[PDB]
Amino acid sequence: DIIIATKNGKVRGMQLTVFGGTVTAFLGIPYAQPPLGRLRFKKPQSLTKWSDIWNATKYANSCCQNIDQSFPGFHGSEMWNPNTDLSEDCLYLNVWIPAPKPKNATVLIWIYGGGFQTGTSSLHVYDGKFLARVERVIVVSMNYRVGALGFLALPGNPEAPGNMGLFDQQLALQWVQKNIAAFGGNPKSVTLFGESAGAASVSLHLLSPGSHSLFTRAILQSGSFNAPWAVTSLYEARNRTLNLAKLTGCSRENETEIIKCLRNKDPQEILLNEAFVVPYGTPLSVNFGPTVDGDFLTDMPDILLELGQFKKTQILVGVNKDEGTAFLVYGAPGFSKDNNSIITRKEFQEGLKIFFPGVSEFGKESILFHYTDWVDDQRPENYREALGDVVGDYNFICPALEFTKKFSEWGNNAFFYYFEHRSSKLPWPEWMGVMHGYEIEFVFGLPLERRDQYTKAEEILSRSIVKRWANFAKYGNPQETQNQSTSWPVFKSTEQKYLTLNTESTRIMTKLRAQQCRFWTSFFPKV
Ligand SMILES: *[C@@H]1O[C@H](CO[C@@H]2O[C@@H](C)[C@@H](O)[C@@H](O)[C@@H]2O)[C@@H](O[C@@H]2O[C@H](CO)[C@@H](O)[C@H](O)[C@H]2NC(C)=O)[C@H](O)[C@H]1NC(C)=O
Ligand SMILES: *[C@@H]1O[C@H](CO[C@@H]2O[C@@H](C)[C@@H](O)[C@@H](O)[C@@H]2O)[C@@H](O[C@@H]2O[C@H](CO)[C@@H](O)[C@H](O)[C@H]2NC(C)=O)[C@H](O)[C@H]1NC(C)=O
Ligand SMILES: *[C@@H]1O[C@H](CO[C@@H]2O[C@@H](C)[C@@H](O)[C@@H](O)[C@@H]2O)[C@@H](O[C@@H]2O[C@H](CO)[C@@H](O)[C@H](O)[C@H]2NC(C)=O)[C@H](O)[C@H]1NC(C)=O
Ligand SMILES: C#CCN1CCN(CCCOc2cccc3ccc(/C=[N+](\[O-])C(C)(C)C)nc23)CC1
Ligand SMILES: *[C@@H]1O[C@H](CO[C@@H]2O[C@@H](C)[C@@H](O)[C@@H](O)[C@@H]2O)[C@@H](O)[C@H](O)[C@H]1NC(C)=O
Ligand SMILES: CC(=O)N[C@H]1[C@H]([C@H](O)[C@H](O)CO)O[C@@](O)(C(=O)O)C[C@@H]1O
Ligand SMILES: *[C@@H]1O[C@H](CO)[C@@H](O)[C@H](O)[C@H]1NC(C)=O
Ligand SMILES: *[C@@H]1O[C@H](CO)[C@@H](O)[C@H](O)[C@H]1NC(C)=O
Ligand SMILES: [Cl-]
Ligand SMILES: [Cl-]
Ligand SMILES: [Cl-]
Ligand SMILES: [Cl-]
């Protein structure tokens, strides 16, 4: 029996066998008052102590959310769907500690992605027991509110101020500061890491002054706040709140009376109406997301980034070779996970309408002009690949590179990676390549389990990534120093060196996607 005294009461964990060793897991520790009733849409409230022993021996409820229904029975999509009951009562976190109890272990805190509308910390690919077993770090992950319940915004109104899911994250970072020393962790050595919207969340904690003292360093996998989907204007946020108010029958002159009416609606009526709150949506629509609330985020974050107003520390940032392909089978004409998806020029132009609905004719022609200058115009997958690269460069790769450039300009060490290995177990077809989200299982060390169907070269790759991430968190420097590995150079705004991650040979390269990102980052914001 393993019982740990926290600030709010005792918690009981469970022992797990991992690679002929042992890890102690505490699953489903509450870190806030359940945000129900009059607490729905408000910032998370502190917890009243308990006197029994809280049993933290199973994952908790995931937060309310809509579920992807495009491919029922298909593991490629269903592996991202929540795997515990959905409930508003979802403000819980998990802790994996090495056995025997460490003395002053570095702490890694995971923030999951999902477009700020979906996600849960209990997914199989987020299991922290391997990192705890192999590197002797402590791993923490939390559930935070998503969709309208996490991000509905009436700017300035405490009954629905916005950014509630971000304050959920922040209250969990505070829980670690106040309690992790009792688990053997070092609260002065905490690294946040996250992917997609989780990575955008990490980047906003670098900018929020209320998070400054709650972590040391940051890792951003395939996301950053300057991505076009990641921050919502106060303009759209207000239009979106009122549109939801109309859809549920809650239109009222007194703004606060709207929130009260929305608080007597069942979670399912809210969830079903989130989608139509926007006139035209895309596969990357973030109906309810982060806003400039004047609290978590004190100014538009492009301005904070440009003018150097962020926590000065080291960052690790990276992207995957085929970020864009996953979204093509969720609406682009002629695309299918079940054939090779060779599209024509006409289908390509229609795909741009789907992904850029509010963009002028000239705006769409300029995308086409820049991405259809083939070497061999006979290659039948020309248009299929162009649309993938368009979606990935615009939405993930060029924002992450620009974030890294601007951040490094204020004097801190940054390290950039390009992940280009396609999992041998990947259920999606080969044309989709090295997809968004499929580096995560290598970061968490699932290929170190010989019992799965991963190759020997993938065990080797994951082992190296796990050491680099852990060395970054402990020491600020993501080297693998023992096995004659390639040295990872610092990313500077001048030379812009990055490291490639693959099973063949890691290489140092310069100026990733230079020509493409000049288009997206300089020209296209004007249109
Ligand atoms: C656990 O270790 C900390 C030191 O953490 C390191 O220093 C940080 C600056 C950061 O770089 C981390 O990544 C490092 O791992 C010890 O902190 C000391 O605490 C005493 C008393 O509180 C204080 O007088 C010292 O100045 C602190 N030292 C530093 C460098 O800040 C802490 O005591 C250790 N705790 C245990 C139980 O071993
Ligand atoms: C701001 O919202 C209005 C209203 O949205 C409509 O009603 C909501 C309940 C929801 O069902 C939306 O999907 C609806 O569109 C938007 O006004 C509509 O705009 C579309 C096209 O832009 C038009 O076809 C509708 O007739 C408009 N309806 C009304 C009542 O004016 C408006 O576009 C939104 N603002 C922005 C900038 O998009
Ligand atoms: C690749 O598949 C898409 C999608 O086709 C669907 O999946 C299969 C079960 C197929 O057998 C059809 O029953 C399904 O519709 C194909 O796109 C469709 O093409 C037809 C033209 O014949 C068109 O009428 C549909 O609207 C298209 N559907 C969508 C969603 O765009 C596509 O033609 C296939 N490509 C190749 C190269 O085979
Ligand atoms: C996969 C995939 C494709 N699908 C797209 C649509 N999604 C519908 C619900 C909302 O998801 C999202 C909406 C908007 C922007 C988004 C950006 C990134 C992501 C990333 N992820 O979801 C994971 C964590 C990698 C699985 N999701 C976003 C379901 C996933
Ligand atoms: C909390 O757990 C206490 C200990 O029981 C443990 O859990 C059971 C399921 C066995 O698997 C074994 O590992 C332990 O004996 C219980 O005595 C206590 O009642 C539990 N509390 C609540 C509220 O259920
Ligand atoms: C929404 C939800 O998950 N509710 C509760 C579930 C179900 O009520 C039952 O398992 C029957 O479905 O049961 C628990 O009490 C349990 O048995 O550990 C945990 C949880 O609080
Ligand atoms: C709205 O109603 C609340 C509660 O009755 C009240 O405190 C607030 O002042 C009202 N505001 C307006 C503008 O009527
Ligand atoms: C270094 O190589 C040895 C070879 O036996 C291997 O066992 C070990 O896991 C490697 N370490 C890393 C960090 O890759
Ligand atoms: Cl209540
Ligand atoms: Cl161009
Ligand atoms: Cl052509
Ligand atoms: Cl150009």
The CATH class designation is Alpha Beta
Helix content: 25-40%
Query: What's the CATH architecture?
Result: 3-Layer(aba) Sandwich
Total individual domains:
1
Would you report the number of β strands?
16
The number of distinct helices, counting runs of at least 4 residues, comes to 15
| Beta-strand fraction estimate | 15-25%
Overview of the structural elements:
- The protein has 527 residues and is of the alpha/beta class.
- Helix content is 31%, strand content 16%.
- It is built from 15 helices and 16 strands.
- It has helices at residues 75-78, 129-135, 147-151, 164-179, 197-207, 234-248, 255-263, 267-273, 301-306, 345-355, 361-371, 382-408, 440-443, 456-475, 514-523, and strands at residues 3-6, 9-12, 14-18, 21-30, 53-55, 62-63, 86-87, 92-98, 105-111, 138-142, 185-195, 217-221, 315-320, 414-419, 497-501, 508-510.
- The strands form three sheets. The chain has an eleven-stranded mixed sheet, with helices on both faces. It has a three-stranded mixed sheet with strand order 1-2-5, with no helix packed on it.
- Strand 6, helix 1 (75-78) and strand 7 (86-87) form a beta-alpha-beta unit.
- The protein starts with a strand and ends with a helix.
- The structure holds a molecule of 3 linked components (NAG-NAG-FUC) (3 copies), ligand AI6, a molecule of 2 linked components (NAG-FUC), N-acetyl-alpha-neuraminic acid (SIA), 2-acetamido-2-deoxy-beta-D-glucopyranose (2 copies) and chloride ion (CL) (4 copies).
- One chloride ion (CL) binds next to loops.
- Glycans are attached at residues 15, 55, 104, 239, 254, 339, 453, 479, 483-484.
- Disulfide bonds join 63-90, 250-261, 398-517.
